[PDB]
Amino acid sequence: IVGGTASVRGEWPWQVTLHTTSPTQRHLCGGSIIGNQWILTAAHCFYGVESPKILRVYSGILNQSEIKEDTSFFGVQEIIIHDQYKMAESGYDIALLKLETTVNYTDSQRPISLPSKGDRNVIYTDCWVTGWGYRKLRDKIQNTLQKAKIPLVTNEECQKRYRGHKITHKMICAGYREGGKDACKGDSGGPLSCKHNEVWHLVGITSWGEGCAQRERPGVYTNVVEYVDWILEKTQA
Numbered sequence: 001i002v003g004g005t006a007s008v009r010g011e012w013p014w015q016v017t018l019h020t021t022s023p024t025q026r027h028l029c030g031g032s033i034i035g036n037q038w039i040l041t042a043a044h045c046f047y048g049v050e051s052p053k054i055l056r057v058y059s060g061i062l063n064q065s066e067i068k069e070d071t072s073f074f075g076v077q078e079i080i081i082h083d084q085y086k087m088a089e090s091g092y093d094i095a096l097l098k099l100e101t102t103v104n105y106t107d108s109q110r111p112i113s114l115p116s117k118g119d120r121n122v123i124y125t126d127c128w129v130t131g132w133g134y135r136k137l138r139d140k141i142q143n144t145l146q147k148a149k150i151p152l153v154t155n156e157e158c159q160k161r162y163r164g165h166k167i168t169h170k171m172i173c174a175g176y177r178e179g180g181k182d183a184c185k186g187d188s189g190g191p192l193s194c195k196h197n198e199v200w201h202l203v204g205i206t207s208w209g210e211g212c213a214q215r216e217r218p219g220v221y222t223n224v225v226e227y228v229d230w231i232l233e234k235t236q237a
């Protein structure tokens, strides 16, 4: 996260850190708890992941440094990537992780609601991007989960900033005209969380952008509301 601040313990309890363990253990991507056995994340996270066997999902983490050889984690039973996914910038950047067991929810590990039936035309004005990603293009994974408030932009404005890409209704963009706050490398797969009537909703999944926090280059997120039917089909199968 560029231009962000440190979170405190319990602040973003749906946020997970997805680790790979091959060839060494490290943070790969963010994700969001959406059910007791379900994480929603980005499809691009699994480029070069040989199988679910090497993945570990950690919940209830503020600092990457908390994770040691005895820290509990959830195994991944299945990775469900959207069947139309090819590359982040072309869309369908969405994946479900089915966990090997159920999360018992606690103050530190909580679900976030999907955008609700009947809310398709809500204007979200309180949206936040979170993660352990870089603070600039050439950086490192951060120890403490970072947060930044970022305004949504219209798809029409977003398309005008990305004339080399197809910005579709299945994407949502967020950024400041003058830049300075954004997601960056290592934030992908995590949430764009928006609060409406004091309830958090998973509005976006961090996906891609041109640079990080540049002027007139909003971050591009998977528009979760346009995948609710897909999510419900996969999580009810």
Ligand SMILES: Nc1n[nH]c2cc(-c3[nH]c(CNC(=O)/C=C/c4cc(Cl)ccc4-n4cnnn4)nc3Cl)ccc12
Binding pocket: 026, 027, 028, 029, 133, 137, 140, 141, 182, 183, 184, 185, 186, 187, 188, 189, 206, 207, 208, 209, 210, 211, 212, 213, 218, 219, 220, 221
């Ligand atoms: N353990 C690790 N050390 N170093 C790492 C790097 C990565 C990593 N992830 C990605 C995937 N993209 C993203 O996370 C977010 C992109 C991104 C998203 C928005 Cl909304 C706006 C601008 C973005 N931009 C970021 N950079 N150019 N644009 N690329 C890299 Cl490289 C993952 C893990 C580690």
